[PDB]
Amino acid sequence: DKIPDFVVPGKCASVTRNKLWAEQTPNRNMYAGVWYQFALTNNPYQLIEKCVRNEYSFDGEQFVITSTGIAYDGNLLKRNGKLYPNPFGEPHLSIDYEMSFAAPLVILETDYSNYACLYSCIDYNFGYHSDFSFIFSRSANLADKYVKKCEAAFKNINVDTTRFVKTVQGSSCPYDTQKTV
Amino acid sequence: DKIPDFVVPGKCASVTRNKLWAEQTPNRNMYAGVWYQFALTNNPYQLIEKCVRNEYSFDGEQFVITSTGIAYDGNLLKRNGKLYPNPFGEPHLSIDYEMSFAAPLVILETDYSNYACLYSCIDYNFGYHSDFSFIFSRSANLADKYVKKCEAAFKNINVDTTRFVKTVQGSSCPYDTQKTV
Numbered sequence: 212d213k214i215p216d217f218v219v220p221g222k223c224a225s226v227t228r229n230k231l232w233a234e235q236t237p238n239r240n241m242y243a244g245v246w247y248q249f250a251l252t253n254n255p256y257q258l259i260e261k262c263v264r265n266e267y268s269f270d271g272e273q274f275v276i277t278s279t280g281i282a283y284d285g286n287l288l289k290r291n292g293k294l295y296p297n298p299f300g301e302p303h304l305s306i307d308y309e310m311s312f313a314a315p316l317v318i319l320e321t322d323y324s325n326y327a328c329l330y331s332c333i334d335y336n337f338g339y340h341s342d343f344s345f346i347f348s349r350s351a352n353l354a355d356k357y358v359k360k361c362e363a364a365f366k367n368i369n370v371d372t373t374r375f376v377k378t379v380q381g382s383s384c385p386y387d388t389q390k391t392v
Numbered sequence: 393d394k395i396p397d398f399v400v401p402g403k404c405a406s407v408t409r410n411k412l413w414a415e416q417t418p419n420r421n422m423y424a425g426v427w428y429q430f431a432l433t434n435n436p437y438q439l440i441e442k443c444v445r446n447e448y449s450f451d452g453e454q455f456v457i458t459s460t461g462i463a464y465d466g467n468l469l470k471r472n473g474k475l476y477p478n479p480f481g482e483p484h485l486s487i488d489y490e491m492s493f494a495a496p497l498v499i500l501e502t503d504y505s506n507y508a509c510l511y512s513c514i515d516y517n518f519g520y521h522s523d524f525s526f527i528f529s530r531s532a533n534l535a536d537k538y539v540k541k542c543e544a545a546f547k548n549i550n551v552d553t554t555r556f557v558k559t560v561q562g563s564s565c566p567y568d569t570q571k572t573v
């Protein structure tokens with residue numbers, strides 16, 4: 212196997228989900244709003260290549276999401292998504308998008324006002340797993356102080372942080388147009 | 393570049409899904425039952441290797457599912473699942489399991505009493521798709537005339553049917569203990 216670097220030996224790491232869920236739930240509300248995708252690990256499901264801007268609305272229990280940016284063809288693209296508690300009572304969320312599936316999503320760490328470090332992990336039946344990570348920011352850019360928080364977080368459950376690829380963001384993005392869909 | 397049989401170049405074939413909710417929809421409502429996995433194509437997610445027995449019960453708009461059988465480690469395993477309409481209102485279903493994800497799913501064909509042919513496909517952004525196919529029976533056995541039905545249905549959407557592997561079923565299975573969970 213020369214590929215891919217999102218399939219990884221062993222089973223999905225233990226991340227102390229109950230603890231995160233206990234800490235994050237009373238603040239769930241401050242997770243609402245706009246998050247920009249600062250960086251992610253290799254992801255075969257992402258259709259929005261650049262200017263990735265995620266609009267989160269909260270209904271008191273689940274989130275609805277509008278994701279926008281420029282697709283791989285250079286065109287504007289909008290994808291609807293949802294973020295809600297596991298439908299089986301596990302201490303984590305499901306993130307679900309159209310023309311896609313639903314995956315576990317854990318927030319390893321967030322301050323709500325600057326950054327969030329996201330983790331999705333799926334176990335196979337042959338003793339491997341594949342995971343998918345994200346660094347979210349409230350700005351088109353993220354301070355080194357915060358990038359360093361997610362780095363430690365991802366090192367802490369042995370996600371290889373060299374796997375992160377920076378997302379195009381900043382003044383060249385049509386955020387203003389993205390807002391209107 | 394050793395490539396799994398279930399990762400295939402190209403996009404997910406188009407099934408007219410709207411046509412499948414017309415055909416493959418029963419005269420009268422089926423509220424409860426059990427199917428046995430007769431055969432499937434290679435699947436890295438399926439944790440139950442042998443004796444796969446799928447009991448469903450209907451509530452509201454989702455089938456509650458209990459999957460049991462023998463795991464790859466030789467031990468009995470039970471898995472809880474849910475089946476509901478795609479939440480973004482795509483003309484297909486989500487099949488969702490505890491400790492895994494929710495995948496899209498279509499019933500390619502069935503007669504409600506003998507067999508059912510099921511299909512799940514998803515598109516990747518790097519020019520591949522993964523699909524996963526199932527033949528179900530209401531008993532361990534299945535007449536070859538129904539197997540031929542599923543084969544044609546799968547061949548008709550360009551699934552190499554030489555990918556199917558028969559699942560161990562029969563009196564060697566501890567169905568009874570499986571029933572107790």
Ligand code: NA
Nearest residue numbers: 217252253343
């Ligand atoms: Na990845």
Ligand code: NA
Nearest residue numbers: 245246349350
């Ligand atoms: Na923001």
Ligand code: NA
Nearest residue numbers: 450451452453
């Ligand atoms: Na009902």
